[PDB]
Structures are given as C-alpha cells and as structure tokens.
C-alpha cells in the first residue's frame, strides 16, 4: 500500500568498477538508465540512489494489503526481458494463492553481465510492505488457451507422476485405470574431472618463431608430446590470416585431450 517499492538496480559488482542498470518509477516518470554508478549502500526515496554517473550507454524516459504487482525478469543474448501483471488482493500477510498470466512490456538491449540486484524502497520510519523473490528453471509446461486467446490454466510436468502422465497424453482429463509411466530417473549430484599430470607448456615459440622454414617439396614433420595447449598466450603477439578446423569445433578445443599429435611446416606464395 502507498507504493513503497519503486524499482530495481541490476549489476555485477554494484559499484563504479562495473556497469549497472537502474529501472525506477520516480513518481512523475518511469526512468531506465545503464551507466557506471557510484551506488549508495542504502538506496531509498525521501533521491539518494547514486552520487555521480559517467560513461552512460543506454537511457529511456516515459511520458490489509491491497495491491499485488508481479514481475518476471530474464536475461538472454544481451536482452533483458520484463513481464508484468497486477491483481487486487485482501490477504493480510501472505502470498495469495491463485493463477495469473503475465504479459511482456520490455525487451531492453543493455548487453551487461547481471549477477545481483537490489530493490529500491521509500522511507517515511517506514510503511508496512512486503516483497517476495523466486527463481526460474528450464521446465516443460502445458498451457491451455481459451476461445478468446487467454491462458487460464497450466500443467507442470515435473511436479509428480500424474502431471507427467497428463503431459504425455496431452490432456487435463484421465480415465480410471493403471498406466505405464517413464522409468525411474536420477539426476547427477557431483562433478569429476580427470586429466593427466602435465606441467610444461607446448612449444609454440620454437614451432612458430623458427629462424628457418623448409621448402614445400621438402616439407618437415615434428612430433608434439607431454604438453599443455593453452594458445591464449599467442593472443598478445602472434596472429594468423588462415585458421581452419575440419574434424573438430574450435570452441571445444580447450576441453579436449589429443593423441598422436604431429606438426608439418613449410612456405608457399599467397595464391597457393
């Protein structure tokens, strides 16, 4: 009641060393801005959000609890998605039970790394208000669309075996009987990585920075063994006009171990 919550700040470090985005309702405008902020520890509305801002990248300006306001936030491929919904309530101190569908309002191209967020609240000392936070996960859902196009119900397949039986049949209705369900599943609870004990870096300098290179007709081959293939060291100095992988993706190279490695060297004219 009396709009205590005013907005959010999303950021990684929440200081001036990293960019952050502030979305607030300032009483006479909705303002969104993404800059390097000197965020205060206690951000509230009497406007004590930040001291100074520099290197700004994005800006957007607009033209007995009673009120429940619901939002969903996601971040993806440099886009922050916001979904919104509202419901009148009379519950005293709990989250009312029920079903409501949120609708998109914002798709912002910020291109920042978000690991943390903090809410912005007014101080009067302070009025009674509550907010609630939950976390999202990849899941399969079955949605029911009505004749007008409204989503009025849904089924979460992972909740229990009956919900999966429903999702498998594609029905909210099930007749009496016994049905065969998927086999018992177990989810992993640990991570194991086993690699050989190697303490030496591969000889990039000797191969690439060799004083003399042979003729193509008399090409030379050299064995490579017992070494750590980092190749990020080359980023500082050595650069290649041609780099092509055939049987392997370039992205997977860092996570692999290689057997029977050989390197062949020669010199040709550009056209060849």
């Amino acid at each position: 009641k009396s709009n205590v919550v005013r907005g959010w700040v999303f950021g990684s470090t929440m200081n001036n060393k990293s960019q952050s985005v502030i979305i607030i309702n300032n009483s006479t405008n909705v303002v969104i801005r993404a800059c390097n902020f000197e965020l205060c520890d206690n951000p509230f509305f009497a406007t004590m959000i930040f001291d100074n801002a520099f290197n700004c990248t994005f800006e957007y300006i607009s033209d007995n609890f009673k009120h429940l306001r619901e939002f969903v936030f996601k971040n993806k491929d440099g886009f922050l998605y916001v979904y919104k919904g509202y419901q009148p309530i009379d519950v005293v101190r709990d989250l009312p039970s029920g079903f409501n569908t949120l609708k998109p309002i914002f798709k912002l191209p910020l291109g920042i790394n978000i690991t943390n967020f903090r809410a912005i609240l007014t101080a009067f000392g302070t009025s009674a208000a509550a907010y609630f936070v939950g976390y999202l996960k990849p899941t399969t859902f079955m949605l029911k669309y009505d004749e007008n196009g409204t989503i009025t119900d849904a089924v979460d397949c992972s909740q229990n075996p009956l919900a999966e039986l429903k999702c498998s049949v594609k029905s909210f209705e099930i007749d009496k009987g016994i049905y065969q369900t998927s086999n018992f599943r177990v989810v992993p609870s640990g991570d194991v990585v086993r690699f050989p004990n190697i303490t030496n870096l591969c000889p990039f300098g000797e191969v690439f920075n060799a004083t003399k290179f042979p003729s193509v007709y008399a090409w030379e081959r050299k064995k490579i063994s017992n070494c750590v293939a980092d190749y990020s060291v080359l980023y500082n100095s050595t650069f290649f006009s041609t780099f092509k992988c055939y049987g392997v993706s370039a992205t997977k190279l860092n996570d692999l171990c290689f057997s029977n490695v050989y390197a062949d060297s020669f010199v040709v004219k550009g056209d060849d």
């Binding site: 969903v72 029920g98 569908t101 949120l102 609708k103 939950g134």
Partner: peptide, 14 residues
C-alpha cells in the same frame, strides 16, 4: 528470510 509457497504463480505468454 521467511519461506512461502508459490502455488501457480509465474506463468507468462511465451
């Protein structure tokens, strides 16, 4: 810090 239940909240248009 109190723990509450989210019964069927959070569905949005895909």
């Amino acid at each position: 810090y109190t723990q509450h239940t989210s019964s069927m909240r959070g569905v949005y248009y895909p």
